[PDB]
Design a protein around this ligand. Sequence first.
Ligand SMILES: Cc1cc2nc3c(=O)[nH]c(=O)nc-3n(C[C@H](O)[C@H](O)[C@H](O)COP(=O)(O)O)c2cc1C
Ligand SMILES: Cc1cc2nc3c(=O)[nH]c(=O)nc-3n(C[C@H](O)[C@H](O)[C@H](O)COP(=O)(O)O)c2cc1C
Ligand SMILES: [Mn+2]
Ligand SMILES: [Mn+2]
Ligand SMILES: [Mn+2]
Ligand SMILES: [Mn+2]
Lengths: 131, 128, 282, 282
Amino acid sequence: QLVYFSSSSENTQRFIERLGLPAVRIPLNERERIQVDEPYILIVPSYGGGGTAGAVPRQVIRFLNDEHNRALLRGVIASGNRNFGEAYGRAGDVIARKCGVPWLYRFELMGTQSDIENVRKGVTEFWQRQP
Amino acid sequence: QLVYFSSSSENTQRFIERLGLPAVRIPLNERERIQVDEPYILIVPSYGGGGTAGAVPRQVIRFLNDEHNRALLRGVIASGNRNFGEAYGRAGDVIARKCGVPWLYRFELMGTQSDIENVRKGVTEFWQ
Amino acid sequence: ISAINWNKISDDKDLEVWNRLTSNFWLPEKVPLSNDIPAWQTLTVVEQQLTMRVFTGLTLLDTLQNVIGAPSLMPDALTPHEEAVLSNISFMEAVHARSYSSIFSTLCQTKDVDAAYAWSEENAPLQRKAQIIQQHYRGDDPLKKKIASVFLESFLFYSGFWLPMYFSSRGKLTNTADLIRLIIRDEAVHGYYIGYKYQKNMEKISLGQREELKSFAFDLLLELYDNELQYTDELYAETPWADDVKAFLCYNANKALMNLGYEPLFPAEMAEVNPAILAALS
Amino acid sequence: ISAINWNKISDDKDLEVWNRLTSNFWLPEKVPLSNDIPAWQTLTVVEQQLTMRVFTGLTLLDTLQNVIGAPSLMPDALTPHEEAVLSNISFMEAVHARSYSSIFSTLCQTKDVDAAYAWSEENAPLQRKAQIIQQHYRGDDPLKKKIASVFLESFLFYSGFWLPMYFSSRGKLTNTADLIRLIIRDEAVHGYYIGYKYQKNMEKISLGQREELKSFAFDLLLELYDNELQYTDELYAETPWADDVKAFLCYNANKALMNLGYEPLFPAEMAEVNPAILAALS
Ligand SMILES: Cc1cc2nc3c(=O)[nH]c(=O)nc-3n(C[C@H](O)[C@H](O)[C@H](O)COP(=O)(O)O)c2cc1C
Ligand SMILES: Cc1cc2nc3c(=O)[nH]c(=O)nc-3n(C[C@H](O)[C@H](O)[C@H](O)COP(=O)(O)O)c2cc1C
Ligand SMILES: [Mn+2]
Ligand SMILES: [Mn+2]
Ligand SMILES: [Mn+2]
Ligand SMILES: [Mn+2]
């Protein structure tokens, strides 16, 4: 399974659509929170820094610091833009280090065809090497 | 006597014109230079800092580091704008310390009638 | 359109002002406004209400400067570098406007802020001022636009700026005062530069046309002045400060005139400002 | 004119982008460009000429963005906060254009710089590119202006941006590369926000019109692309680098498309950037 966040600009949403895999969206509305039942990879865009100063969107922080959800986190994929330099995909690095999970992939905006193919292959292989 | 500088915006020039006292202008053109033969008060605008950082215009520095000119300096009046806060009239302060002469007066832009009146009175009493 | 070349400056003043304005860049986030909360609490309801009404008024006028004011000057630019400087000026008007919201966010209650905004919409002097200024910005006379702009922000704004300067002298809201001083530093340079360009534009019109414009400038001045006295009455109604504000307006009116190259209009007696207010400025 | 209230945000993206763009404020004086003089001196005459021709070209286009591009978007703003953000964008285009002059002043000979400006004036693909973009900025279709703006600076500029990134990968002109990365960081956000607004604007129109704009956008993309291959050919003619430049162009074209909400069009084969160039970015 997959969990993702996408802001109102919906680049990560557009990626998930084209990916073709079942996924659950962390609600855009900050007051709404969701619970997941199974192991998952998290896909999140980087947002340092406009509405939070921090790399990870508030909604994802809210989702993660519920230890129920955190315990089922198995990996992270981050999106963003290479033009941000060292900060490119920062959300993935931050989540990975804090939660003790691997940073699996890093892509730009809505993702290229290569990104889609790589992530499709990567995820299938990831669950093959998972309990 | 009076020595002054005014940039292309001519605020200090207009003060001098309305003061009505005899005065010599440090050339706007940086390549030209002048000398004076009698003791004077200097009136200078502040310009920290549109690419030079220094509050004293380059033309005034060139005028002052002539030994003959510097020796005849006796006092400084600074123009500027109160809206620059602590930096209001900063050029007079810099010149006052560097040259060891008193900073005599502070005024804004082309000067009010009060400024003209105050300087007229101050100048006469200073030389006596 | 031709590539701008900053190594071929036509008027030195363009570079000088470009450098002064850009190197003075600030944002309201850089001012520790939260350190004013205890001071805000000690202010009376009437003082608090005054502060919010003052700043909602300034928000309207800085918004006007950003959206219409500075852009309206762009077709009348003498050089490509002036056009660029006007781009900075416009953006900094948005920063000025934004900063009042910063004050509201930190210090004030939403409902009261919204009431102050509502009071501003309804205040006849405020709206008349905006209307008069906008009318000249939308006109076909480039020189009258410059006069209006210099009058708005080197003169009219000072009915509003008086208050944080007063608080500063009493050792209250010192951080809000520091924020306002940043705005005032920008506006001093804006007024200087626009007034400078006004005088440059005037060099290319006839002597008769200059006298006509001089008369217009003093007419507009007195019309705006009369309006601002009424705005001041209504703003400072439940305080003893009106006369002091009016003296500060005359003092600033004189500087605005000097920015345009005209001699001060108001005699010392009308422009005698409380020394603590002057000290708050510098 | 209404008074802007930053505590009543209609679209959170306006505040996010305002914060990102203003907190990223920079000036070329903040970069120690003079430290590139040794590196500059080690470049071949071919490399030096190429560098100056690149930057004179970018100067023209950033001037276009400041004087016409960004202002052309202002009347089509959905919110007052967007108007304010667009004021920042316009000012930063002035900063971008100014920074090329900073480079020239620090590193180059005036005669060579003026010859590069002349070369740019007479370069057909460059002038055709400038003509096409401003034709759309002068048109009556707000949505086509946004398309052209995104294509210019999230796509076409990268034929130029390639060069400092390449030099960076070799340990030469590293400070100039640092400056270009500041421009690139701005443009990434400019393209994102303008493209975001383009999509918001399209929510309000018929399917038929959306399909028309899609067809127009892809045809404009291919028109500009083919023109840019010619520009690249002429710019990089004395070097072996045209193919890598073109791959970097295709890579960025895909990003420009995605900013507009369209899927990337250029296959992996065409957009395969040398890892050292990608490393120079991040
Ligand atoms: C305010 C702001 C800050 C951003 N910061 C970063 C960043 O630090 N690193 C990065 O790779 N991308 C950054 N981005 C780019 C976004 O992560 C990227 O556009 C992403 O596709 C947005 O996804 P979404 O539309 O699903 O919300 C930033 C974008 C914005 C608007
Ligand atoms: C770029 C710039 C920087 C300035 N800096 C200061 C300053 O630091 N302190 C001050 O009191 N006035 C400052 N001023 C205001 C001028 O000193 C003032 O307008 C003066 O009247 C100019 O005189 P002039 O027109 O004869 O050159 C500055 C003006 C400019 C344009
Ligand atoms: Mn302002
Ligand atoms: Mn202003
Ligand atoms: Mn740009
Ligand atoms: Mn741009």
